[PDB]
């Protein structure tokens, strides 16, 4: 609970807690639990928000998105998930929530848990809100979240700028009429489709029929509004802009940053930005536009102009009349100009590329199916019925090759990872890389070039060491791996657990694009509570009893 | 020679010859020959127009482009080509010149001739200018034209609008620092690169160093100017526009059309447009912008804003100050709104899709090299030392499978061709299809959609017959096959000969994307003069003697 967070002083929170507190090591002790129940159901012939009926969706509590989780910094969040799907298992991952010493609540099926079985299986997740800001949750059972198993998280806390009104969450997502499993199958042998539409806060107009509605955000004239923008897509990467208005970024993913004013923002799959918008213009209706850059390298939609309306209270109704100017093309790249409020510094002039710190991403066309993604020579394929944690609990170190284990034994040390984007392959695509259990530092990437140009870069220390930044670089949970290039990341090994690190494009992680960082496995075993172990075993027993009865095969990585 | 062609009456030409004359069957007898000599040399470490030195170019008469060929309607054009290259053969194709009953002058090596050998080989081409308008010529010896063996053709004649000043030719081309053979090799196993620059009428500024010059066109205030725009690229497809001005199309390729005013034009590789521009704006300097659409599906450049300067005579010098607005995205499609002055009419209701009128294009990834393009199951591969004409002249009908012969015996009849763009492949690209020996009618294509959307269409008579147009449809020599879709063309068998029909993206035809229409072969043999036969055999004898001594292999289709 806050005691001194006001519109003119958003920096403050409570005694000993403010915007400069190192939230990674210090958390308010509130004693409060916010609980939720997620009832997952399978709905056929569901009428979506743009008027088109979908074959099948999988919904939490009967809505397009699950409950908007809301709590205060230091609260505990507890969610009982009840799987009433017909065939699919499920596992809810809390994206952006680092699960400090709570790895078994990460929701990574095949890694930290077996899936919750259908026809009534249940599991209760319980995690501490040790970071404030805007995050989201979604199923990690193959590409199930593309069917509807997705929602938002708002953990309240201090901010790096004053503002008057918190508009709350604003999820933006691609929308397909085909079901997720259909699309996984299709993308195994075909380039992925454009989205049929892009929903903004749950709604959109159909570009063909005009059915549906624009999201409509009412701004209070003269007021400063915090808007929490998310990209909850399966594939599309968005540029966003508001006609005649700037946006001032105050957080990236769940990391507060120094205020940064911009005309447009790029959001990768899984990324979030908290912005402050001043309703300082003439009262009127203004378009909030979703647009695509990078010449389709990171998505497109069959709706040519997905948009929301921002309406000044007391202005006339109807639609905006100013179409605006197109934003700069972001070329499928997130900005590296954001600077966290609470700083980190690491050396970069000692980095040496080696097999054991390099992660070569490659598209392998030689097998079946056609599109298989490999990291360091292997496409990930996890065992839903024998998760990595089962090996840990049984003291078995014979991890299958397909689990793509990268064991990291270093204790609370900075570790450096060079990710290489198929620089020798026939073609390369941008990939939104996402790390569980940690924020990483973005130390640098290959030079910014047009995303579709097929220019390639291999890390060359004689030119590239000088291009790295270890002095409070961007810190977050998702960032772009440039088409044909490389990305250098660091994270500190402060959190024993098995942590996925994967491209967040659904089709690609389905197709194998992940590794699993096994961080300090010796320490992990000691820190698993009897309750967590017992419940892990309970759910695994039920899943293993269920699986033989499933009418459908597993067709992908499981992730 | 014209006798009544004036600025106020461009429709007139001479007695019995005007804009309405069927130029496909009636030609002025002028008795004039315009002759040229093309001396091809190989130049290492050549300074190009943007300040960058290229490893190797292949030039006609020591210049970036060969002679502008200029003649009148009904003149004869004669060109002696002398091949002073070190290793390569050569063969000059006159793109847009239909070569009516002069098939052996078409310059298609492996089809209508053997290549002219290096170290001083020579051959004289002679053709009747039976069409007026703007065309171009280029080597057809693999992708050699990408090294510099390229130039323009202007055959004067009447026009569909009055105008004051003929500004002449304005070729626009992609420009690569890498030589053509290196790019063929690269594109056999890799997606093609963006161009390093785009030259406009021979020049460009370097996007990195600022070296070079903008093309500078001086407009006479209040005057109507004809500008002859061409795309002489190896791969890039261009959108063009002039800030604050419209352009009125008066011809498409070599076909005069009813005046059509537009804000921007899409030019496929090998396409031409004659436009009339009125200098009716405020006297100033205006940008002529080259832009890319279709989400990089039909090319891009590492120069983000290639442009030329249009200067009003009497205005200040220096650079334009208005950046203007981006044109409509043409989505890699030429317009089907053009309507030829001299009409043609064919039935479309009666078309039935059959194997013998369908040309399925496919990318085959299963062989060596990776990218091989096949039409109706076969990647074309010509024999430079045994051209199709050699088979004709020796009465040999055992054409190799790889010559992709489509024999068309119909005498002077309309023939209908459905080209299908790999609708069941994993990934499809737009292709600029070009026919030798004829203009074709563009009867229809699959629905216009975003080029990178990967939406696929298979011809369906129940919906598509109604979407065809046989009432004076666009008529020209090059048009776009839509990504993932289909294109229906028609041509009349009025010209016996062996005629290539191929994608004009150099990398694609090199990789096999062509067929060879063998039109009325019996009539063809009857029509070959003893002079044409003796000279064909002469060059073949020389080429065949040369080839065993060549130090390099043939690594592609030969075309
Ligand atoms: C999780 O639950 C999902 C929802 O029930 C399961 O997805 C189903 O999985 C099966 C088996 O993989 C699919 O069946 C195959 O579908 C293809 C394509 O059929 C569809 O599309 C074509 C072409 O447009 C159309 O003609 C059909 O009407 C379908 O709409 C067929 O060709 C195959 O023969 C086969 O039937 C289902 O399509 C798929 N359903 C959906 C809605 O995604 C999934 O398997 C479950 N996962 C697990 C691990 O239990
Ligand atoms: C027509 O004349 C052309 C001009 O001489 C001939 O083109 C040459 O063809 C040869 C044989 O294929 C090429 O040699 C190959 O080059 C590749 C790639 O080398 C590249 O990379 C190195 C550095 O890594 C660089 O030094 C080069 O410049 C290239 O960029 C090699 O991997 C092969 O082993 C082989 O050497 C020539 O590169 C190519 N030259 C040019 C300028 O294009 C062509 O073969 C002639 N055609 C015929 C049929 O006679
Ligand atoms: C922001 O989003 C808005 C709303 O989607 C966009 O407005 C739309 O702009 C397009 C393109 O200019 C308009 O379509 C055009 O309609 C006219 C008919 O008047 C027609 O000439 C064209 O063929 C074209 O289809 C569309 O009317 C308009 N939508 C609405 C509801 O006003 C706007 O372009 C977006 N701005 C940016 C910078 O992305
Ligand atoms: C038509 O072609 C011209 C000439 O290439 C284009 O003008 C160029 O426009 C770009 C984009 O606005 C300018 O680049 C920008 O410059 C500013 C200021 O230096 C810089 O802050 C940006 O980072 C960016 O580099 C460029 O100055 C300008 N070129 C010149 C010589 O004036 C124009 O955009 C084209 N128009 C269309 C519709 O394509
Ligand atoms: C996003 O859409 C939701 C719809 O759920 C909006 O939340 C509703 O807002 C209206 C008006 O303020 C209230 O009557 C409802 O009680 C709200 N519903 C819920 C479930 O919270 C929300 O305002 C939208 N966000 C923005 C920024 O416009
Ligand atoms: C967006 O929402 C607002 C409600 O906040 C609507 O604004 C009202 O519009 C009506 C007329 O349409 C006016 O009578 C009211 O006075 C407006 N209220 C406020 C608070 O300003 C607006 O119409 C909505 N826009 C759309 C497209 O539905
Ligand atoms: C990627 O795979 C290679 C194997 O090809 C790994 O390289 C080995 O790493 C181990 C452990 O550090 C060393 O003991 C060996 O010397 C390496 N073998 C070779 C052939 O170099 C590499 O560690 C893997 N990288 C990651 C990050 O997982
Ligand atoms: C484009 O060409 C025109 C015509 O040569 C140049 O126009 C001259 O500009 C100078 C000033 O630089 C004047 O003194 C002349 O009187 C102009 N001539 C005419 C006929 O208008 C122009 O400078 C060139 N532009 C560029 C960018 O070099
Ligand atoms: C494409 O290839 C197919 C297969 O070789 C050709 O189809 C044959 O055409 C002949 C002549 O009409 C028929 O007698 C055969 O029945 C066809 N065979 C099959 C398997 O259908 C077809 O003609 C080729 N098309 C073109 C345009 O060259
Ligand atoms: C791996 O699957 C894909 C294939 C694509 O198609 C190709 C392409 O198009 C951009 C260019 C070159 C090769 C491609 O693969 C067949 C494009 C994709 O991007 C959305 C893509 O994800
Ligand atoms: C889940 O929701 C369905 C549909 O509303 C309902 O019938 C069922 O009882 C719910 N089950 C649980 C455990 O909440
Ligand atoms: C250890 O795990 C491997 C791989 O799953 C398995 O085959 C083996 O039997 C396990 N051993 C024990 C003792 O559990
Ligand atoms: C061709 O040009 C070269 C270089 O200019 C010259 O030396 C040579 O003599 C010319 N050959 C002929 C036959 O024109
Ligand atoms: C093109 O360049 C040529 C030669 O450099 C020049 O004579 C001609 O005027 C230019 N054409 C135009 C339209 O500017
Ligand atoms: C046709 O040409 C091939 C290749 O040169 C030859 O082997 C064959 O004998 C020729 N047949 C006839 C009928 O001349
Ligand atoms: Cl996470
Ligand atoms: Cl031609
Ligand atoms: Cu996620
Ligand atoms: Cu996550
Ligand atoms: Cu990816
Ligand atoms: Cu994940
Ligand atoms: Cu050509
Ligand atoms: Cu041609
Ligand atoms: Cu092509
Ligand atoms: Cu050709």
Phi, psi for B35 (deg, rounded to 5): -115, 155
Contact call for A426 and B295, based on CB within 8 A:
no
Are B267 and B134 in contact by the 8 Å Cβ rule? The answer is no
Cβ neighbours, 10 Å, residue A345: 11
Q: Among residues A254, A224, A97, which one has the least CA distance to residue A162?
A: A224
How far does chain B reach from its first CA to its final CA, in angstroms? 36
Provide the token pair at B500: 């290539």
Taking the CA of residue B377 and the nearest CA in chain A, the distance in Å comes to 20
B302 contacts A450? CB cut-off 8 A? yes
Q: How far is CA B487 from CA B193, B235, B426, in A?
A: 27, 20, 19
A345: β partners: A471
Ligand nearest to the CA of B60: 13
Please indicate if any CB of chain A lies within 8 Å of the CB of B207.
no
Experimental method: X-ray
Instruction: Assess whether the C-beta atom of B179 lies below 6 angstroms from ligand 2.
Output: yes
Q: What number of other Cβ atoms are within 10 A of residue B259's Cβ?
A: 15
- Contact at CB, B194 and A296, closer than 8 angstroms: no
Question: First-to-last CA distance in chain A?
Answer: 36
C-alpha span between B440 and B434 (Å, rounded)? 9
- What letter does residue B75 receive in the DSSP assignment? -
* CA–CA dist B353, B356 (Å, integer): 8
Residue closest by Cα to atom 17 of ligand 9: B355
Size of the A and B interface in Cβ pairs below 8 Å: 65
Decide: A129 and A74 in contact? Cβ < 8 Å. Answer: yes
Q: Residues 6 or more apart from B118 whose CB is under 8 A from it?
A: B83, B84, B85, B86, B87, B88, B89, B90, B546
Among B201, B283, B317, say which to mutate for ligand 8: greatest number of ligand atoms within 8 Å of CB. Answer: B317
Q: B301 vs chain A: nearest CA distance in angstroms?
A: 8
Query: What is the helix (H) or strand (E) element at residue B364, kind and residue range?
Result: strand B358-364
Determine contact: A296 vs chain B, CB below 8 A.
yes
Spatial distance between the Cα atoms of A142 and A486, rounded to a whole number of angstroms: 27
Residue B180 contacts residue B361 (beta carbons within 8 Å) = no
Question: Order of strands, edge to edge, in the sheet holding A372-375?
Answer: A372-375, A358-364, A414-421, A486-492, A440-445, A475-476
Residues B322 and B287: beta-carbon distance below 8 Å: yes
Q: For residues B440 and B21, give the distance between their C-alpha atoms in angstroms, rounded to a whole number.
A: 18
Task: For tokens 């626009």, name the residue.
Answer: B172
- Which strand (E) or helix (H) includes residue A185? helix A180-187
CB of B208 within 8 Å of a chain A CB? The answer is: no
- B301-329 per-residue burial string, b: 16 or more CB within 10 A, e: under 16: bbbeebbbbbbbeeeeeeebeeeeeebeb
Structural domains of chain B, ranges and CATH numbers in brackets: 1-158 (2.60.40.420), 159-342 (2.60.40.420), 343-559 (2.60.40.420)
Enumerate helices (H) and strands (E) in chain A, giving the number of each.
6, 32
Q: Are strands B33-47 and B76-84 parallel, antiparallel or unpaired?
A: parallel
- Give the chain A residue whose CA is nearest to the CA of B429: A191
Could you tell me whether strands A33-47 and A76-84 are parallel, antiparallel, or unpaired per DSSP bridges?
parallel
- Tokens encoding A88: 């699919």
Name the strand (E) or helix (H) holding B509: helix B506-510
Residue B191 to residue A427, Cβ atoms within 8 A: yes
Chain B residue with the nearest C-alpha to that of A303: B450
Residue nearest to atom 9 of ligand 10 (CA): B427
Mutation pick for ligand 11 pocket among A36, A38, A41, A63 (CB with most ligand atoms within 8 Å): A41
* Residue B535, both tokens: 């000279």
Q: CA-nearest residue of chain B to A301?
A: B453
- DSSP code, position A548: G
Which numbered ligand comes closest to the C-alpha of A292?
3
B291/B307 Cα distance (integer angstroms): 9
User: Is A507 exposed, middle or buried (CB count within 10 Å of its CB: 0-12, 13-18, 19+)?
Assistant: buried
Say if residues A433 and A479 touch (Cβ distance below 8 Å).
yes
Instruction: Determine the Cα–Cα distance for residues A500 and A518; give it in Å rounded to an integer.
Output: 9
Query: B333 - beta bridge partners?
Result: none
Q: Are strands B514-519 and B405-408 parallel, antiparallel or unpaired?
A: parallel
DSSP letters, B267-290, are E-TT-EEEEEEE--S-SSEEEEEE
Distances (CA, A) of A93 to A39, A144, A381, A488, A497: 15, 12, 18, 25, 15
Residue B39 in contact with ligand 13 by CB distance below 6 A: yes
Identify which of B433, B428, B440 has the alpha carbon closest to the alpha carbon of residue B515: B433
> How far is residue A472's CA from residue A341's CA, in Å, rounded to a whole number?
9
Cα atoms in the 13 Å half-sphere on the side-chain side of A459: 23
3-state DSSP assignment of residue A526: helix
Q: Tell me how far apart the alpha carbons of residues B73 and B32 are, in angstroms, rounded to a whole number.
A: 10
Please state the φ and ψ torsions of residue A180, each to the nearest 5 degrees.
-55, -45
* Cis status, amide bond into B369, omega within 30 of 0: yes
Q: Which of B271, B227, B40, B237 is nearest to B135 (CA)?
A: B271
Half-sphere CA count of A503, side-chain side, radius 13 A: 36
CB B222 within 8 A of CB B229: no
Chain A contact present for B96, CB below 8 A: no
**How many Å apart are CA B105 and CA A93, to the nearest integer?**
69
| Closest C-alpha among B292, B285, B342, B343 to residue B310 | B285
Residue B109 · residue B540 · CB < 8 Å: no
CA distance B402 to B515: 9
Beta carbons within 10 angstroms of residue A465's beta carbon: 16
Decide if A52 contacts A177 (C-beta within 8 A).
Answer: yes
Q: Which residue of B has its CA nearest to A371?
A: B426
3-state helix, strand, coil in chain A (%, to 5): 15, 40, 50
A365 close contact with B: CB closer than 8 A: yes
Which residues of B are annotated binding-site positions for Cu cation?
Answer: 93, 95, 138, 140, 431, 434, 436, 502-504, 508
Cis peptide before B202 (omega within 30 of 0): no
Spatial neighbors of B51 by CB under 8 A, at least 6 apart, are B206, B209, B211, B212
């Amino acid at each position: 609970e806050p005691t001194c967070n006001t519109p003119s002083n958003r920096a403050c929170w409570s005694d000993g807690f403010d915007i400069n507190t190192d939230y990674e090591v210090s958390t308010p002790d509130t004693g409060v639990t916010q609980s939720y129940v997620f009832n997952l159901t399978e709905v056929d012939n569901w009428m979506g928000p743009d008027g088109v009926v979908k074959e099948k969706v999988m919904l939490i509590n009967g809505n397009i998105m699950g409950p908007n989780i809301v709590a205060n910094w230091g609260d505990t969040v507890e969610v009982t998930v009840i799987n009433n799907l017909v065939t699919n298992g499920t596992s809810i991952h809390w994206h952006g929530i680092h699960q400090k010493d709570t790895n078994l609540h990460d929701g990574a099926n095949g890694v930290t848990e077996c899936p919750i079985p259908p026809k009534g299986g249940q599991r209760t997740y319980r995690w501490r809100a040790r970071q404030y800001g805007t995050s989201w949750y979604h199923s990690h059972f193959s590409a199930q979240y593309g069917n509807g198993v997705v929602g938002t998280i708002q953990i309240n806390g201090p901010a790096s700028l004053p503002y008057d009104i918190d508009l709350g969450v604003f999820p933006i997502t691609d929308y397909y009429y085909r079901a997720a499993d259909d699309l996984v199958h299709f993308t195994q042998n075909n380039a992925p489709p454009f989205s049929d539409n892009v929903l903004i806060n749950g709604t959109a107009v159909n570009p063909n029929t005009g059915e549906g509605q624009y999201a409509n955000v009412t701004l209070t004239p003269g007021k400063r509004h915090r808007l929490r923008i998310l990209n909850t897509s399966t594939e599309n990467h968005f540029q966003v802009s508001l006609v005649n208005h700037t946006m001032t970024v105050i957080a990236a993913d769940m990391v507060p940053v120094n205020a940064m004013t911009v005309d447009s923002l790029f959001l990768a799959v899984g990324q979030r930005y908290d912005v402050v918008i001043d309703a300082s213009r003439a009262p009127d209706n203004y378009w909030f536009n979703v647009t695509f850059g990078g010449q389709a390298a990171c998505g497109g939609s069959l709706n040519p102009h997905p948009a929301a309306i921002f309406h000044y209270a007391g202005a006339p109704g109807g639609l905006p009349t100013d179409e605006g100017t197109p934003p700069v093309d972001h070329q499928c790249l997130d900005t590296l100009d954001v600077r966290p409020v609470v700083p980190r510094s690491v050396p970069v002039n000692s980095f040496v590329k080696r097999p054991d710190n390099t992660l070569p991403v490659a598209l392998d066309l030689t097998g079946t199916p056609l599109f298989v993604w490999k990291v360091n020579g292997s496409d990930i394929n996890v065992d839903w019925g024998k998760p990595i944690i089962d090996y840990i609990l049984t003291g078995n170190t014979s991890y299958p090759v397909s689990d793509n284990i990268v064991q990291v034994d270093a204790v609370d040390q900075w570790t450096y990872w060079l990710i290489e984007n198929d620089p020798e392959g026939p073609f390369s695509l941008p990939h939104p890389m996402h790390l569980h259990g940690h924020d990483f530092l973005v130390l640098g990437r290959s030079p910014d070039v047009p995303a579709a140009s097929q220019q390639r870069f291999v890390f060359d220390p004689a030119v590239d060491l000088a291009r790295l930044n270890g002095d409070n670089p961007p810190r977050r949970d998702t960032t772009m791996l440039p088409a044909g290039g490389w990305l250098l990341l660091a994270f500190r090994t402060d959190n024993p657990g098995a942590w996925l690190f994967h491209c967040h494009i659904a089709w690609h992680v389905s197709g194998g694009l992940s590794v699993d960082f096994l961080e300090r496995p010796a320490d992990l075993r000691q820190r698993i509570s009897q309750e967590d172990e017992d419940d892990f075993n309970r759910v695994c027993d039920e899943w293993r009893a269920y699986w033989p009865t499933n009418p459908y095969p597993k067709i992908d990585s499981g992730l």
